[PDB]
Design an enzyme around this catalytic site. Structure first.
Site, mmCIF file in Angstrom:
data_model
loop_
_atom_site.group_PDB
_atom_site.id
_atom_site.type_symbol
_atom_site.label_atom_id
_atom_site.label_comp_id
_atom_site.label_asym_id
_atom_site.label_seq_id
_atom_site.Cartn_x
_atom_site.Cartn_y
_atom_site.Cartn_z
ATOM 1 N N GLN A 164 0.328 -1.376 0.510
ATOM 2 C CA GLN A 164 -0.671 -0.067 -0.054
ATOM 3 C C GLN A 164 0.577 0.976 0.004
ATOM 4 O O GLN A 164 0.930 2.285 -0.176
ATOM 5 C CB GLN A 164 -1.105 -0.048 0.843
ATOM 6 N N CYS A 192 -5.845 0.801 3.587
ATOM 7 C CA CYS A 192 -5.581 -1.187 3.855
ATOM 8 C C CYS A 192 -7.365 -1.283 3.592
ATOM 9 O O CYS A 192 -7.348 -2.869 2.926
ATOM 10 C CB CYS A 192 -5.082 -1.069 5.694
ATOM 11 N N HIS A 236 -7.133 -1.689 11.005
ATOM 12 C CA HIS A 236 -6.414 -2.410 9.872
ATOM 13 C C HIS A 236 -7.782 -3.268 9.236
ATOM 14 O O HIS A 236 -8.286 -3.678 10.158
ATOM 15 C CB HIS A 236 -5.015 -2.893 10.418
ATOM 16 N N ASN A 281 -1.495 -9.355 4.074
ATOM 17 C CA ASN A 281 -1.615 -8.000 4.556
ATOM 18 C C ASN A 281 -1.341 -7.110 3.005
ATOM 19 O O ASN A 281 -0.566 -8.136 1.891
ATOM 20 C CB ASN A 281 -0.794 -8.028 5.858
HETATM 21 C C1 LIG Z 1 -5.190 1.457 7.026
HETATM 22 C C2 LIG Z 1 -4.320 0.816 7.599
HETATM 23 C C3 LIG Z 1 -3.143 0.953 8.693
HETATM 24 O O1 LIG Z 1 -1.917 0.603 6.960
HETATM 25 N N1 LIG Z 1 -1.866 0.708 9.226
HETATM 26 C C4 LIG Z 1 -2.526 0.322 10.546
HETATM 27 O O2 LIG Z 1 -3.375 -0.145 10.820
HETATM 28 C C5 LIG Z 1 -1.591 -0.202 11.021
HETATM 29 C C6 LIG Z 1 -0.708 0.468 10.346
HETATM 30 O O3 LIG Z 1 1.051 -0.430 10.689
HETATM 31 C C7 LIG Z 1 1.082 -0.911 11.689
HETATM 32 C C8 LIG Z 1 -0.746 0.121 9.321
HETATM 33 C C9 LIG Z 1 -0.112 1.710 8.721
HETATM 34 C C10 LIG Z 1 -0.174 2.860 9.800
HETATM 35 C C11 LIG Z 1 0.298 2.997 10.853
HETATM 36 C C12 LIG Z 1 0.412 4.203 11.613
HETATM 37 C C13 LIG Z 1 -0.971 5.136 11.894
HETATM 38 C C14 LIG Z 1 -1.268 6.029 12.696
HETATM 39 C C15 LIG Z 1 -0.105 5.624 14.121
HETATM 40 C C16 LIG Z 1 -0.164 7.439 15.280
HETATM 41 C C17 LIG Z 1 -1.356 7.914 14.869
HETATM 42 C C18 LIG Z 1 -2.254 8.385 14.220
HETATM 43 C C19 LIG Z 1 -1.993 6.929 12.955
HETATM 44 C C20 LIG Z 1 -1.384 4.781 11.084
HETATM 45 C C21 LIG Z 1 -1.560 4.116 10.049
HETATM 46 C C22 LIG Z 1 -6.366 2.270 7.569
HETATM 47 C C23 LIG Z 1 -5.454 3.816 7.545
HETATM 48 C C24 LIG Z 1 -5.839 4.743 7.329
HETATM 49 C C25 LIG Z 1 -5.533 6.108 9.221
HETATM 50 C C26 LIG Z 1 -4.379 6.918 7.710
HETATM 51 C C27 LIG Z 1 -4.267 8.231 7.946
HETATM 52 C C28 LIG Z 1 -3.772 7.978 9.461
HETATM 53 C C29 LIG Z 1 -4.785 7.682 10.398
HETATM 54 C C30 LIG Z 1 -5.798 6.098 10.192
HETATM 55 N N2 LIG Z 1 -7.420 2.178 8.471
HETATM 56 C C31 LIG Z 1 -8.570 2.515 7.785
HETATM 57 O O4 LIG Z 1 -8.585 2.855 6.647
HETATM 58 C C32 LIG Z 1 -9.479 1.737 8.959
HETATM 59 C C33 LIG Z 1 -9.855 0.122 8.526
HETATM 60 C C34 LIG Z 1 -11.089 -0.633 8.930
HETATM 61 C C35 LIG Z 1 -11.263 -1.722 8.769
HETATM 62 C C36 LIG Z 1 -10.952 -0.318 10.874
HETATM 63 N N3 LIG Z 1 -10.787 2.393 8.961
HETATM 64 C C37 LIG Z 1 -10.190 3.529 10.479
HETATM 65 O O5 LIG Z 1 -9.469 3.151 10.609
HETATM 66 C C38 LIG Z 1 -11.984 4.071 10.230
HETATM 67 C C39 LIG Z 1 -11.833 5.641 9.042
HETATM 68 C C40 LIG Z 1 -13.018 6.240 9.178
HETATM 69 C C41 LIG Z 1 -14.635 5.762 8.266
HETATM 70 C C42 LIG Z 1 -12.322 7.545 8.435
HETATM 71 N N4 LIG Z 1 -11.749 5.544 11.481
HETATM 72 C C43 LIG Z 1 -12.079 5.838 12.458
HETATM 73 O O6 LIG Z 1 -13.644 5.650 12.145
HETATM 74 C C44 LIG Z 1 -11.807 6.888 13.240
HETATM 75 C C45 LIG Z 1 -12.648 6.369 14.433
HETATM 76 C C46 LIG Z 1 -11.638 6.748 16.049
HETATM 77 C C47 LIG Z 1 -13.923 6.750 14.866
HETATM 78 N N5 LIG Z 1 -12.397 8.321 12.850
HETATM 79 C C48 LIG Z 1 -11.411 8.625 11.756
HETATM 80 C C49 LIG Z 1 -11.639 9.384 14.008
#
Ligand SMILES: *[C@H](CC(=O)N1C(=O)C=C(OC)[C@@H]1Cc1ccc(-c2ccccc2)cc1)[C@H](CCc1ccccc1)NC(=O)[C@H](CC(C)C)NC(=O)[C@H](CC(C)C)NC(=O)[C@H](C(C)C)N(C)C
Length: 215
Positions: free
Chosen positions: A19, A25, A162, A182
């Site tokens: 990605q 993800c 994730h 993954n």
């Molecule tokens: C994909 C997930 C992802 O790529 N990663 C992880 O979950 C863990 C990873 O590495 C270890 C990777 C990369 C990563 C690493 C670290 C962070 C991080 C660290 C510290 C603080 C903040 C973030 C992030 C990613 C994506 C990641 C989305 C993302 C991107 C940038 C910043 C933050 C989050 N995950 C998702 O798309 C998930 C997947 C679902 C199936 C669970 N979706 C979500 O997280 C929700 C998406 C909405 C619809 C925007 N999030 C929420 O609902 C939240 C909650 C608290 C209500 N909103 C945004 C407030």
């Protein structure tokens, strides 16, 4: 349901993807599910497009995240059930900017009529997957940067963040486990994969499991 299932072994799973510096993800999970459900409906295995969803799906939020369920719906409702190929819509958000949506000059590689959402039960999820194929799931991955291999067994977990793909399990093993694909390249985990313990809701694996349906 059988002792062990592994849809890679039956030719249902494409290679591990990357990605990059994008929070997509949820797109890779959705697409990898389709990729496999397509194949298991008598079609040959084709790599499909995540970039389609990152760029074009506005119900979700591209590199700032989304959920697989929304991605299935956008395909159906908004995009006429179609999923383009990776070749005619290549992935371009690896640097971290999702470039803008383009609605033509692609090629449809697969199609879906909808999706089912499995109940929050490991054994029913296992049972279903044995028959119907890989399953897109939500998990806590707060702590996976560390993961080098083995069967993750501790994974204490406070929220879902994730998306990934169940492709199998094994109940014979001393530690029963799921097999999860993954999208952080073949470097991470076990050549791109991770096993987590099956039967104790590890990493919240039961909580938001779903799958596409090819008509
Ligand atoms: C994909 C997930 C992802 O790529 N990663 C992880 O979950 C863990 C990873 O590495 C270890 C990777 C990369 C990563 C690493 C670290 C962070 C991080 C660290 C510290 C603080 C903040 C973030 C992030 C990613 C994506 C990641 C989305 C993302 C991107 C940038 C910043 C933050 C989050 N995950 C998702 O798309 C998930 C997947 C679902 C199936 C669970 N979706 C979500 O997280 C929700 C998406 C909405 C619809 C925007 N999030 C929420 O609902 C939240 C909650 C608290 C209500 N909103 C945004 C407030």
């Amino acid at each position: 349901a059988p002792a062990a299932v592994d849809w890679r072994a039956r030719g249902a799973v494409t290679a591990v993807k990357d990605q990059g510096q994008c929070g997509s993800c949820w797109a890779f999970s959705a697409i990898g599910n389709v990729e496999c459900q397509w194949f298991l409906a008598g079609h040959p295995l084709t790599n499909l497009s995540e970039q389609m969803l990152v760029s074009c799906d506005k119900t979700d939020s591209g590199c700032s995240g989304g959920l697989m369920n929304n991605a299935f719906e956008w395909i159906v409702q908004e995009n006429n059930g179609a999923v383009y190929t990776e070749d005619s819509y290549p992935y371009a958000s690896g640097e971290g900017i999702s470039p803008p949506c383009t609605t033509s000059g692609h090629t449809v590689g697969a199609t879906i009529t909808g999706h089912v959402e499995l109940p929050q039960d490991e054994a029913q999820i296992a049972a279903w997957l044995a028959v119907n194929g890989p399953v897109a799931v939500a998990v806590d991955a707060s702590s996976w940067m560390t993961y080098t291999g083995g069967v993750m067994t501790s994974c204490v977990s406070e929220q879902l963040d994730h998306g990934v793909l169940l492709v199998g399990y094994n109940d014979s093993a001393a530690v029963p486990y799921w097999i999860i694909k993954n999208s952080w390249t073949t470097q991470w985990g076990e050549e791109g994969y991770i096993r987590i313990a099956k039967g104790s809701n590890q990493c919240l694996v039961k909580e938001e499991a779903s799958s596409a349906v090819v008509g």
